Amino acid sequence: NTKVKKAVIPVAGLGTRMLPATKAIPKEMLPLVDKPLIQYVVNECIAAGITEIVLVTHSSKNSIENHFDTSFELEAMLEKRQLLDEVQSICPPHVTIMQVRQGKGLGHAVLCAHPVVGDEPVAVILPDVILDEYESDLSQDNLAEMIRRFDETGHSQIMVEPVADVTAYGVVDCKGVELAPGESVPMVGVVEKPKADVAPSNLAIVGRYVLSADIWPLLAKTQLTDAIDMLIEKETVEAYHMKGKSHDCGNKLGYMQAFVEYGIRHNTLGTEFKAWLEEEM
Amino acid sequence: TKVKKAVIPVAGLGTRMLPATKAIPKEMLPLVDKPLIQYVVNECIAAGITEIVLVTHSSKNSIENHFDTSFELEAMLKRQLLDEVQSICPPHVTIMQVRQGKGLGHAVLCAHPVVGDEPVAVILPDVILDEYESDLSQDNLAEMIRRFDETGHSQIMVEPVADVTAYGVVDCKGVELAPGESVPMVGVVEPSNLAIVGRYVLSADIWPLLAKTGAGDEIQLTDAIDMLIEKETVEAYHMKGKSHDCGNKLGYMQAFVEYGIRHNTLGTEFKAWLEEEM
Amino acid sequence: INTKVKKAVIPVAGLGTRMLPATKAIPKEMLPLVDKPLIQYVVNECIAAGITEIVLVTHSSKNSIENHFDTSFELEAMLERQLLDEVQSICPPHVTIMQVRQGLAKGLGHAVLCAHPVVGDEPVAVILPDVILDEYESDLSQDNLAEMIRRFDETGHSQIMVEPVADVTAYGVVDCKGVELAPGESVPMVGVVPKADVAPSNLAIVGRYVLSADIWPLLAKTPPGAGDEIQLTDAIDMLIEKETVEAYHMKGKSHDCGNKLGYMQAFVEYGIRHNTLGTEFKAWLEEE
Amino acid sequence: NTKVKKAVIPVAGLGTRMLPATKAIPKEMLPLVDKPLIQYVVNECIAAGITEIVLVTHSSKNSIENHFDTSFELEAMLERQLLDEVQSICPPHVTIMQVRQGLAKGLGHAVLCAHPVVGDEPVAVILPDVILDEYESDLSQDNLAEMIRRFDETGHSQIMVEPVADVTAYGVVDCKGVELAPGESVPMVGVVEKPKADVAPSNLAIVGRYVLSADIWPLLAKTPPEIQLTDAIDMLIEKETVEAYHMKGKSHDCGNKLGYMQAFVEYGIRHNTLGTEFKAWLEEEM
Structure with a gap:
């Protein structure tokens, strides 16, 4: 297959921009309607073919791991069914979530x-950026595509998108060079919040990377960008x-x-919610 | 001020919000950027309650942690923020926690x-009384308590329904009831179009009645009621x-x-974004 | 008539340094004396004395103490016999444990x-939790905390447990x-110190108090040291x-x-x- | 170098034999004086050259991981000798990873x-409730470290045993x-669980330390007609x-x-620091 077996997901120490919602719950567990951000992120990984997920964590982060693990009492009450199927359907059996502690910096x-x-x-993969499952085919585009391409050329892939500011x-x-969605073109560097007038493109780092085993030694010599x-x-x-689309x-x-x-x-509730929004706006 | 304690049952596990609540308490789901329990507690405080008792569960330390001070966090933020964050639980308010051993009455x-x-x-915590459509420091709980204190008559909040x-x-x-008023209730039928919203201000007389009080072998507060x-x-x-x-x-x-x-800070932009998008 | 001392307060919020690294990620109060954490002995002592309301004044990283006394769902599941009932009886039904967080407040007075x-x-x-009152060497249902509570009901005077020290x-x-004190006796104390030639007594403060409702305003008015520190000795x-x-x-005896x-x-x-193992252990101990 | 880089420590099951102390703290966090058992075991893996430890765990055991991680609030709280001791817990070149076991299914599982x-x-x-005595062997040269060196030489898996009376x-x-001297590795032709003394092939018991070839993996993947490590062996x-x-x-x-x-x-x-005194104390008291 592909030498890209593992997805490393850094778990936010503290998502300060989201206080105080995230003062006592990880931002990765904040929900999009009824699922936590990390459940979309893990499923994106899985749709691309990744079966091993390495969460790079901190002490106050157990709930993310418990979300994918089995919850004894909960399931007990549940038997006591769909939701039950659902709660144990969160992590497919062929998928393994691993955890390592970081105790700063993404490259770190x-x-x-x-x-x-x-x-x-x-x-x-950064966990607070969600690639829209309805807007693209995650099983074929994006991370899935970046990995196929890496396999084909051995060249690292770095997801990007056009941004106004x-x-x-x-x-x-x-x-x-102009790029169309779906294409890969060489990058000769990265500019940290450039000043408009001197910016290399309008192409922003999205938070998805497929990297060659060579970043490893580079990371040690070294943020991700500098080893990049x-x-x-x-x-x-x-x-x-x-x-x-990304969110x-x-x-x-x-x-x-x-x-x-x-x-x-x-x-189940999208149309009704949409209808309500229309008579409400 | 006779009523200084509010009991908030938050020890149940919250099914209708799965899978979001699998590993996090339903009471910590955010309404924008504040967990449901923060709005709830703020509502109690505005009404003059200074002691909140969470009847809890093993898995809900996140709720107490939200109200306690987050050292390493505080170690982290900033001036503006750092304030807002300690400020979650003001100094005169105490959150106490007791573990439940099922039902609201119990x-x-x-x-x-x-x-x-x-x-x-x-106080039922998955019900939110809208702070912008009422004056929570003068109305609803605020006033139902002010009236208990003035007359020692218990108060149960209700609102008109459709079905x-x-x-x-x-x-x-x-007796026709209007927003803001109280009038004796003789019980409930499952007589008026008014339903129990989930806020109660009860005389110390319920305790003994609650001890002497089930459907699934649960203790019903209606019963003591x-x-x-x-x-x-x-x-x-x-x-x-308005309630939510x-x-x-x-x-x-x-x-x-x-x-x-x-x-x-974001209401205007979101509303405009919404208006176009929607 | 029932005493008015209904609650015991147990400060368990500190991070116990003298016991590191053992207590680095577990409460010092959860350290076992053989096969039971220190806290269970302490709560039982409160209970032997008739207290049925215990207030733990805690910290965020110490949920294990409350879990100890609550029902341990999965464990009972995987337990369903003696252990089940032992485990099931750790906190009697009539005993309530409440917790409150100490938060930023520093000091025992806080x-x-x-x-x-x-x-x-x-x-x-x-009650300070790291000091264990020997259940075999006295009757905790009549002595010590139990007797200080009775003395306070009979005189209105706050009680401070002390014990004799050579040093x-x-x-x-x-x-x-x-004035001399014999075990079980309470006598007015006018202060607390001590070099040795100037010591006012051989009686050291043990870690148990039965205080009147008057400590409350005093505690709130106790002058702080830096960072709000309010010490209980000051309030005392x-x-x-x-x-x-x-x-x-x-x-x-105390431990x-x-x-x-x-x-x-x-x-x-x-x-x-x-x-159960006393005999075998003692013997193994004599051998070694 | 050795291909044996990782040590798997199953610490997921709940330890009923030690209740009630273990009702709410993991058995691996009980202290042997002033250190949790898991610190001894981790230190032993390190002495043998291991620098990657995999805990196979359970949700209620974060404390085991916190023990080795940085205790920010504590450190702050200490910021001297002790602060060092405290950080030093896990050596910077050694990493602890964790995986949760699904349904409680056995060591094999x-x-x-x-x-x-x-x-x-x-x-x-490595079974973490068994402690190999540091004072009585050189953990940097014998036991796991030796087992690993013999595997690297020969490629033969090594199963640790010690003589028992029963x-x-x-x-x-x-x-x-065949007789084995301490430190000696001898081929084994079988393993048996709890034999009646009259049919027992030896008096040498499985202690709880193993260095296994990559070939046990496909063997552990098989479901019996409970997945057991000895059956895989x-x-x-x-x-x-x-x-x-x-x-x-000696083992504990x-x-x-x-x-x-x-x-x-x-x-x-x-x-x-306290042995001399503690011993004296015990004498007078015994």
């Missing part, structure tokens, strides 16, 4: 997974243009918008 | 040792403004939007 | 003050104006000042499980006495 | 759950009647040579009350 959270991952290519993100330098730009010095790495639930308004969008699409 | 019983034989407020077939309606021997009734004058208080049942998925999704539009 | 809202303006017992240079020693000195305080002479050596000595002493 | 973590590689299996209480190996013997390794020094079974109380006293006598 990645390095922490080194020992679990080995000296192999890996996927890095560039100063707010980390922009990639694709030497001015160092990797770039050694090999080709490409920007992959995200297909569909950034790491910012309050982004989260509120996602809440509503997923609300309108809810399998 | 949940309230467990708090007896903490409350003592005193008048007590009973009275769908609900339990209090019997007020036919009617008992208190045959012993005394209990009044229905007509809720003012956040214990049902749709009701929760709808309050999320209503509150978002009213959000103090 | 810890006690935190329970005020649960206790009310009522007298209360204050006064290492303790909180009381001044009872040189003002109580002594406001009124009559007696020192009560402990019966039996200070707050220090390493003492927790070890305790573990051994309770092992030898274990209802 | 516990190891099996570590498969995705370890991969198709040889592993060390075989009916253990899983016993069959080495074809017996299937492996069928395919390949497996040796029993005779433990050096702290999975049973008496054994834990004895180990607590034995280690208190040896405590670095």
